[PDB]
């Protein structure tokens, strides 16, 4: 279907404890495939998914350089941002950047992204336009002017429209057997008695990929949304994910409740009940 | 495949 490539970057200053820790990771969809950590013994951009491993040494040398460059750009930007905000060199601060592209099943750009955050807060963002900037504050406005002057959006837009899309396509092809295979959740319902009056019904979804999934409880086949507890989808640690959904229901009424599971890997949505 | 250009300082 639709697919995405994302690069995430985090620089954390640690004054009095060396220079900024820089960590960047590359995702295709929900699959980590590259990483770089400025704290690794001899830092290289390293593969983290098999299909990327075919890429040649020129690829790895270049990606390593770009990450190093990003690390350095970030060190400078943390310095600069202290001046923009009149902050002390004594405080630890975070620069975050994400960028990448969405492609439709047709493989053409659906949406491109490039966004920065300073200390957990939006700083500057490429608009959906892929052609204009939105600065969150006065400091970021300074950055905006610098970047408008350099015609950054123009070149970023070409990247999001060209390489990003094209390499995403090629990754998708090289990782066909995995990136393009949807693994359905193994599902089951557990029953957890609270008291003589109530029980928890917990609908489980395990070993699925991609992370996107819908778990819902119905009662007599009618919506039970604002009455449902959904935990955050979580990684199993092997590239698949887990989630559960839970309702507290009157004891002896369990049979009115059906769990419903929608997921790319299911030909048709599931209806599950607790095995009473 | 990562993006990079010169002059991206904030």
């Amino acid at each position, epitope marked *: 279907g639709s697919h995405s490539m994302r690069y995430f970057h985090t620089s954390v200053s640690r004054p009095g404890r060396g220079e900024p820790r820089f960590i960047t990771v590359g995702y295709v969809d929900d699959t980590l495939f590259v990483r770089f950590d400025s704290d690794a013994a001899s830092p290289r951009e390293e593969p983290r998914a098999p299909w990327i491993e075919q890429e040649g040494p020129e690829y790895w040398d270049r990606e390593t350089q770009i990450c190093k460059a990003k690390a*350095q750009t970030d060190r400078e930007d943390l310095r600069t941002l202290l001046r923009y905000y009149n902050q002390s060199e004594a405080g630890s601060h975070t620069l975050q950047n994400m960028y990448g592209c969405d492609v439709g099943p047709d493989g053409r750009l659906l949406r491109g992204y490039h966004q920065d955050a300073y200390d957990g807060k939006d700083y500057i963002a490429l608009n959906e336009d892929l052609s204009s900037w939105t600065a969150a504050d006065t400091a970021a406005q300074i950055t905006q002017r610098k970047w408008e002057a350099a015609r950054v959006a123009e*070149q970023l837009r070409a990247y999001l429209e060209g390489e990003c899309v094209e390499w995403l396509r090629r990754y998708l092809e090289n990782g066909k057997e995995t990136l393009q295979r949807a693994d359905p959740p193994k599902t089951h319902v557990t029953h957890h008695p609270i008291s003589d009056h109530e029980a928890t019904l917990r609908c489980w979804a395990l070993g699925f990929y991609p992370a996107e999934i819908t778990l819902t409880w119905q009662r007599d086949g009618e919506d039970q949304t604002q009455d449902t507890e959904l935990v955050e989808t979580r990684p199993a640690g092997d590239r698949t994910f887990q989630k559960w959904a839970a309702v507290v229901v009157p004891s002896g009424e369990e049979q009115r409740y059906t769990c419903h599971v929608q997921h790319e890997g299911l030909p048709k949505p599931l209806t599950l009940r607790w095995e009473p | 495949k990562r993006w990079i250009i010169l002059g991206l300082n904030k």
Partner: T-cell receptor, first 114, second 112 residues
Framework: KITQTQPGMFVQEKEAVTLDCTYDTSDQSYGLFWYKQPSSGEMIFLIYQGSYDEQNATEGRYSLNFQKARKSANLVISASQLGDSAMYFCAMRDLRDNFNKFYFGSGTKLNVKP | GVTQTPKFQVLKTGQSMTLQCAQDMNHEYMSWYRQDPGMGLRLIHYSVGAGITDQGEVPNGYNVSRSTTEDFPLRLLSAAPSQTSVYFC????????????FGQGTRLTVVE
């Protein structure tokens, strides 16, 4: 590696002049720079071109005829003035060293004839 | 932008001297080149930020310091004839910056 083949170029005042430059880089990311060094010896930045800039740079009378394929980055100076007589350096920084060093060419002495 | 001094300098062999360089552009990156016939522009030292300096292509005979982002003084502890050259202080917004502004230059002559 920057190649300026012309140790010197001459041009009639008011005429336009193209100063040749070719650069050798394996990296897909780089910047080409021109500097002017007049008799008094300063290094005046004139113009910059990014390897990913599709437009050819322009700054006043300076234009950079950037041919990524031909690997040339010729400076064109429109309407040459006597004040243009100087040394012109083609220079480049690339990804290999994270854009650290400037690599300067031998330079070309522009002689604008009145 | 970049105020480099002095523009001219004659030095007796063995004498010290500090070439001065300040920038009022909040530049993180500063560097020193020497310009020599047939040698192009060689990097001597550079500083990607305040408190960080590193050795260029020809650091020997020179030391630098980066106490503040504004200044990048180049120091010749013991002048040698070889160090006769034209020195340029260069600054820019960052390692990957494109605003590459050179100083007026310091023309140095080391005499016996």
């Amino acid at each position: 590696k920057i190649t300026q083949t012309q140790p010197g170029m001459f041009v009639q005042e008011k005429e336009a002049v193209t100063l040749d430059c070719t650069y050798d880089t394996s990296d897909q990311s780089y910047g080409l720079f021109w500097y002017k060094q007049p008799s008094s010896g300063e290094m005046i930045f004139l113009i910059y071109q990014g390897s990913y800039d599709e437009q050819n740079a322009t700054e006043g009378r300076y234009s950079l005829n950037f041919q990524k394929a031909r690997k040339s980055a010729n400076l064109v100076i429109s309407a040459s003035q006597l004040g243009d007589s100087a040394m012109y350096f083609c220079a480049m920084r690339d990804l290999r060293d994270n854009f650290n060093k400037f690599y300067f060419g031998s330079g070309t002495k522009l002689n604008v004839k009145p | 932008g970049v105020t480099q001094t002095p523009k001219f300098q004659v030095l007796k062999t063995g004498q010290s001297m500090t070439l001065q360089c300040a920038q009022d552009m909040n530049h993180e990156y500063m560097s020193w080149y020497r310009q020599d016939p047939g040698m192009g522009l060689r990097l001597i030292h550079y500083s990607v930020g305040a408190g960080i300096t590193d050795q260029g292509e020809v650091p020997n005979g020179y030391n630098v310091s980066r106490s503040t982002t504004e200044d990048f003084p180049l120091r010749l502890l013991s002048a040698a004839p070889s160090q006769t050259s034209v020195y340029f202080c260069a600054s820019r917004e960052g390692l990957g910056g494109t605003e590459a502004f050179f100083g007026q230059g310091t023309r140095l002559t080391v005499v016996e």
